[PDB]
Amino acid sequence: IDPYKEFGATVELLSFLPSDFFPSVRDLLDTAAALYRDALESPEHASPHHTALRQAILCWGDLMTLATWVGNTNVGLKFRQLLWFHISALTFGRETVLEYLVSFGVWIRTPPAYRPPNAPI
Amino acid sequence: IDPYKEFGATVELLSFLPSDFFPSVRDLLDTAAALYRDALESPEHASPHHTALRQAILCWGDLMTLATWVGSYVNTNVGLKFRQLLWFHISALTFGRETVLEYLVSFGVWIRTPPAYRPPNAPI
Amino acid sequence: ELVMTQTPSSTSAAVGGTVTINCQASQSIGNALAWYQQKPGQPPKLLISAGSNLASGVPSRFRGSGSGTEYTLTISDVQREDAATYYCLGTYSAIDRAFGAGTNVEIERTVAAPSVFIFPPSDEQLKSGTASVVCLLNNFYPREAKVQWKVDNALQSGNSQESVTEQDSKDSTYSLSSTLTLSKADYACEVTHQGLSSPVTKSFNRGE
Amino acid sequence: ELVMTQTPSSTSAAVGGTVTINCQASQSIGNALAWYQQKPGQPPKLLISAGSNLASGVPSRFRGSGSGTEYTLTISDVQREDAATYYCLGTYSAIDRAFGAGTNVEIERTVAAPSVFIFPPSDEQLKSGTASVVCLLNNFYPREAKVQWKVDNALQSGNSQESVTEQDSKDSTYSLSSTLTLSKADYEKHKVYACEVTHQGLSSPVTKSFNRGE
Amino acid sequence: EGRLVTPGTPLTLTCTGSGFSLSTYAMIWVRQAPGQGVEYIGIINTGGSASYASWAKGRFTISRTSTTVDLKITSPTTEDTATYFCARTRGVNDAYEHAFDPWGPGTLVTVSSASTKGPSVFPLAPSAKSTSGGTAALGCLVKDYFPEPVTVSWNSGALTSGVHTFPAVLQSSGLYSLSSVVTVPSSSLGTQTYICNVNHKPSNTKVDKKVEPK
Amino acid sequence: EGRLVTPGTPLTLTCTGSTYAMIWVRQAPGQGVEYIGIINTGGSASYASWAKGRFTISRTSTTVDLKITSPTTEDTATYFCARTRGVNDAYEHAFDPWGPGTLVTVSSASTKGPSVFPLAPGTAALGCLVKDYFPEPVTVSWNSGALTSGVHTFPAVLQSSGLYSLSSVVTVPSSSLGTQTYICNVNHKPSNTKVDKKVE
C-alpha cells in the first residue's frame, strides 16, 4: 500500500521536499538511468532498489504508451519521486539518502525563525 | 528491461500460454492478493515477488486512474499484460516460485512441438 | 512540546531469543526517531539512526523499524552482552526533543545460587568506631534474595544496608554486598535465595 | 536439429574460488535447459532444472541462469568435492534433445609431492610364465609426473603402461600406477629394478628400487 | 553391471531402476562411450510412443511394458560398446519434461568377438625395508580378464581410507589389468588382515586375496 | 568526574572535543536521560519547556558551556554533552559522540576524603571497603588495572551520617593468594585522595 515503507521511509518523508526539487522524468530516465547500472537486464535481482526500479520504469512506459495511444496530466508524475529515491539509494547509499530525507523533514517542520543556518545535503 | 528475467522466466514464456487462461484483473487483483497474504504492508520486503507485486498493484492503480480520467467508447485491453504479472508473482507466492516456473517451462515444451507428436498428458 | 512514550518498561529475553521495544510519539516525527544503548556508568551508545540505519559497528541483530508516530526496535538474536537500558529520542523540530522513559533488558539464565563470604572487621578500622562486617553474595542469577544478620541470636534489621550490582555481561548474573555497621561495643549471615536448598551457614568468631 | 555447444572443456578453480560454465543453444528452448553433475563410475546427479531450480537438497552454491539461447551454470563456492564433469542438455521439443560436450572441473591445490612404492612381482605369478612390476605414485598434484623404468639401463620401450586416477574428493590429489609388464622368465637375467619419478613437487627425481631376491 | 555380445547379435536392456509400481514416467535412454560424454538416445511416452534422436534412428528400438521399459539394440557394431543409462521423469511430467533427477546405475555393453576370461589376482607386497618410516603400501593386481567391469573392494568394505582402485588398462593381448592399492600405517602390518575381494561379474569369478609382507 | 556546589550557587560545565551544533542532557542517579537543549552552529540555544530559565547554554570557538543558575537540590545528576555527527547543525536527530559526563551534586554537606580499609580472608575472596566519603563518585581498581577478571564494585549506599560507603571485592583462586600481591587503588577526585592498600 506504501511503496517506501520497507525501504525505511514513507510517502510523507518525500512529501516534505518541494516538487520543483526533483529533476524531470526524462532527466531521471536516460541520464542517471541507463548510464549507471547498465546491467539492470542481468538475470540477477540485486539489492531491492534494482528490482523495484525496474517495475518503476516499466510502469512509466506502460503509462506513456496509453497516453500517446490516445493523443497531459502530470499529477501522475509521482514516479519522479520514486526514480529519484531508488537511484539515489543505489548511487549514494540507502542509509545516507534516507538520513537526508529525515534531516530535511526536520528542516521544514521547524519555524523558520528557529532554523539553524545550514540546510541538509 | 524484462520484468521476469531475474525471477527465472521471460516475457516469451508467459506469451506461450493462451490469453484466456489467465484470470482478469478483477479476480487476480481484488480476489487472490489482499485475500491471501492480507497484510504485506509490514516494513519487511521479503522475497522480491512481494516488492514486485507492490509496484505492480500501485502501477495498475496509476493506470486505472488515467483510464477513468477520460470521462468515443471501448478502450483497449492490449495495454493489459498485468494479468501475467499478477498471476506470475501471486502463483509464485502461493505455490512457490520454483513450481510455477517449472510449469512455465514444461508448458513451454507442450507447445513448440508438432501437435501430432504431443504426449497424452498436458502440464499442470 | 513533544513527549515520547516507551512501551516495554522492563523485559525478559533469553540468549538466542528475541525482545521487542516500541516507541510511540505524541506527534509524528517522520523517522527522526533514533535508538540509543546505555550500560551503567557509560555514556549512551548510539544503536540506530533514523528508521533502520545501523551506524558503524553494531550487531545486525538490532533492527529498527516503524513510521509516523509508531516505531520499534527489535533485538533478534539476543546475547548476554545485551543486558542494558535502551532509550529512544526522536525530534519533532530542531527545538523540541524528548527521550523515552527507558527500557531495562535483563537476560534470562539458569537459576544459580550465590557463594557467600564473611569478611570480619578491619584491624585498622577497629580503632575509630569500627564494627563493619560486610557479607558477600557472589554470582547468583535470580535477583530476588535476602540475607539477615545474627550477632548471637538475632541481630536482624539493626542498621544494615544492602547493595546490588548490575547484571553481568558474561554469565548474566547478579552480585550483592551488604554492610552491617555498629559501634565498638560487642556474627553470622543468613542467605535465603530461590536456588538455595539449605540457606545460610556462614559465620566467623571474633578473635579468630 | 538441436545442438548445444558447450564451453571451456577443462577448467580450473581453487577451494573457495569461482568457476563459470556457459551453455549455448542453437535454438531457443525457453529455459528448458538443465544442469547435471557426473563423477566417474556414477550416473549423473541432477543439478538444476529450468534456469534456477536447484532441486532436492543441492548445495546452494550451484546457481543456474540465462534465458533464450544463452545459459550459465556458476559454481560460486568451489569445494574439493566439486571436482567432476558437468553437462547441459536443454530440450527443444518432446522429440529433439541434445547433450553438451561436457566441462571437466578440477580443483586447484597446493603442490604436493608423491609417495612412490616399488612392488616386485608376485611369487605366484612367476609360475604363470609372466612377471609384472608395479610402481605406485600416491597422493600428488599437479598430476603431471613421469616414471622411468631402469633394470640397470633405461627401459623406455612401451613395455610399460600408466594409469592415473581422478581427482580425490578429500585432498584433491591424483594417484598413478605404472605397471611394467616387460618381464618374462627372463625377468631374472638381471638384478636391480627401479623407478625414476619426476614430478613438479620433487626437488629432484626420486628413484625407488629393489634388488631381486630380497 | 555388464553385458557382452558378439557383433551382429541384437540385445535387450530391461529398465526398472528404483521402480516399485512405477507405471508411467515417460522414460528416456542415454549412452556414454568410455572416457567420452553422454549422448541422448530417445524417449518413450506414456502411450508407448517412442521418439528417437536422428543419429540413433534405426539403430535402436525403445519398447515398454506395464512393469518394465526395454531398449533393444539391433545389429550392434563395435561402435556401440558403451555404458547405457535409463532415466525417468520426476512426477506427473510425461514426455514434456526437460530434466530427470532419478537415474539407473547403468549397464556397460561391450560388442566384441573375444571370449569371456576370468581374472588372475596376484599380491602386491611392499619390501622389508620399504616401510622404513611409518606408512606402508600394499595392493592387488587383477590381470588378464576380457570383459570390462570389475569391482575391487578391501576387507569387505570395512577399509575405505587409503584405497585407490586404478582404471583398467588394455594390454596388447586384448585383456585388461588394473591395480588396487592401500596406504596403511606399517605399525599395523603385524595385526590387521587387509584382504582384497575382487568380483568379476561376467565370468561370475570372485576371489579374496590376503596381502601380506615377506 | 564530579562537582559539588551549595544550593543556590550557579555553576558552569564546559565541553570540548571545534564548533558544530552541541546538545546537553541530564540524568539523575537511578533515573533516565532528560533532554535539555541544543546550541546550533550560529549560537542559537534551544531549550525544553521544563528547563527553560533553569539552565543556560552558551558556546565559543573552542567550547560549549552549560550554566546552572540558582541550582536546587533536585538538580543533582550526571550531565552529558553530545555533538552532531558530520555537517548536520542542529536538525540532527541523533548524536553518536558523547562526552564522558560530569556528576554534579547540590548539597550543604562538606567534602570528605574516603577512608579505605582492607577486606581480608575452593575459591578465595578479598576486597577493599571505601567508607565515609560524601562529595562525589570514587573509582576503585585492582593491581593498577592489571586484574579485571573477578572484580565487582558495588554501588555506594548512602549512610545516615550523610557520607557514602561502597565495597569492591575480587574472587580469585585461593592458591594464588601466596603469590599475587592484590593491591587496590582507590581514586577519589573531588577530595584528590588516592590510596593503595594491599589486601591479604
Side-chain angles (χ1 to χ4, degrees), chain E residues 5-44:
Chain E
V5 153
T6 170
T9 298
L11 64 90
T12 302
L13 308 170
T14 68
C15 187
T16 176
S18 162
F20 291 83
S21 71
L22 312 187
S23 181
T24 76
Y25 284 93
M27 219 186 59
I28 72 103
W29 289 83
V30 161
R31 91 170 191 179
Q32 190 181 32
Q36 304 211 63
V38 283
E39 279 187 344
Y40 164 76
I41 292 186
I43 320 175
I44 175 156

Side-chain angles (χ1 to χ4, degrees), chain A residues 1-2 5-6 40-45 48 51-52 54-55 58-59 62-63 69 73 78-79 82 86, chain B residues 1 5-6 40-45 48 51-52 54-55 58-59 62-63 66 69 76 81-82 85 89:
Chain A
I1 195 172
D2 198 310
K5 58 196 179 57
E6 68 219 42
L40 279 172
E41 43 249 82
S42 170
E44 196 185 346
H45 68 276
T51 181
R54 280 183 264 269
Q55 264 77 352
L58 258 293
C59 195
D62 298 333
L63 286 184
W69 169 239
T73 66
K78 68 138 188 189
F79 291 153
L82 248 191
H86 289 136
Chain B
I1 193 173
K5 53 186 181 58
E6 64 221 35
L40 51 100
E41 42 259 82
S42 307
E44 191 187 344
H45 77 277
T51 192
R54 271 181 264 279
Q55 264 83 349
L58 264 295
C59 188
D62 304 332
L63 281 175
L66 188 57
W69 156 252
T76 75
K81 71 280 286 180
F82 283 74
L85 261 301
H89 293 302

Side-chain angles (χ1 to χ4, degrees), chain A residues 8 10 13 95 99 102 109-110, chain C residues 29 31 49 53 91-94:
Chain A
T10 42
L13 259 58
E95 306 188 344
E99 197 144 314
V102 176
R109 205 206 306 161
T110 88
Chain C
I29 51 179
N31 282 34
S49 185
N53 289 12
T91 79
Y92 177 71
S93 60

Side-chain angles (χ1 to χ4, degrees), chain F residues 1-39 41-60 62-135 137-196 198 200:
Chain F
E1 197 189 342
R3 272 275 272 150
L4 183 67
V5 153
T6 167
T9 303
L11 63 89
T12 299
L13 307 174
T14 72
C15 194
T16 60
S18 305
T19 72
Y20 270 110
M22 198 164 229
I23 72 100
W24 287 82
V25 172
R26 98 170 190 176
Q27 192 181 33
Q31 296 208 69
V33 284
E34 279 185 344
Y35 175 78
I36 292 188
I38 322 180
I39 177 145
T41 207
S44 301
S46 171
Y47 304 167
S49 300
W50 75 276
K52 188 172 181 297
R54 286 163 59 87
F55 308 91
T56 43
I57 296 178
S58 163
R59 93 168 314 178
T60 321
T62 172
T63 316
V64 171
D65 292 330
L66 173 128
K67 180 193 178 191
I68 317 177
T69 57
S70 293
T72 76
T73 306
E74 291 308 290
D75 294 294
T76 167
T78 305
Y79 288 79
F80 306 94
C81 45
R83 57 167 283 262
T84 57
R85 47 155 201 276
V87 280
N88 286 349
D89 174 36
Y91 45 55
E92 171 59 53
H93 64 281
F95 331 104
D96 83 87
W98 284 66
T102 168
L103 196 141
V104 172
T105 308
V106 177
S107 174
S108 168
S110 304
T111 288
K112 183 187 188 306
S115 198
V116 53
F117 307 102
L119 299 174
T123 182
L126 44 78
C128 279
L129 174 58
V130 181
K131 190 179 183 181
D132 300 337
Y133 68 95
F134 169 74
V138 301
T139 61
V140 176
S141 162
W142 286 91
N143 284 335
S144 300
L147 171 142
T148 53
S149 282
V151 54
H152 277 129
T153 295
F154 299 84
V157 61
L158 181 59
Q159 294 170 144
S160 52
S161 319
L163 293 307
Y164 285 99
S165 299
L166 84 169
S167 316
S168 183
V169 298
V170 188
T171 55
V172 202
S174 45
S175 52
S176 298
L177 267 178
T179 64
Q180 193 79 32
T181 55
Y182 307 109
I183 70 168
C184 83
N185 38 29
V186 188
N187 175 27
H188 175 240
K189 187 130 299 180
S191 71
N192 272 24
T193 300
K194 290 167 284 135
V195 280
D196 290 49
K198 179 194 292 182
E200 77 281 356

Side-chain angles (χ1 to χ4, degrees), chain A residues 7-10 12-13 16 94-96 98-99 101-102 105-106 109-111 114-116, chain C residues 28-33 49-55 66-68 91-95 97:
Chain A
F7 297 93
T10 42
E12 51 252 19
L13 259 58
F16 279 102
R94 168 171 146 185
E95 306 188 344
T96 315
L98 194 127
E99 197 144 314
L101 298 185
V102 176
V106 196
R109 205 206 306 161
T110 88
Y114 296 79
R115 284 184 184 176
Chain C
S28 78
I29 51 179
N31 282 34
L33 193 272
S49 185
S52 60
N53 289 12
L54 281 138
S67 47
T91 79
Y92 177 71
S93 60
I95 303 311
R97 290 169 174 70

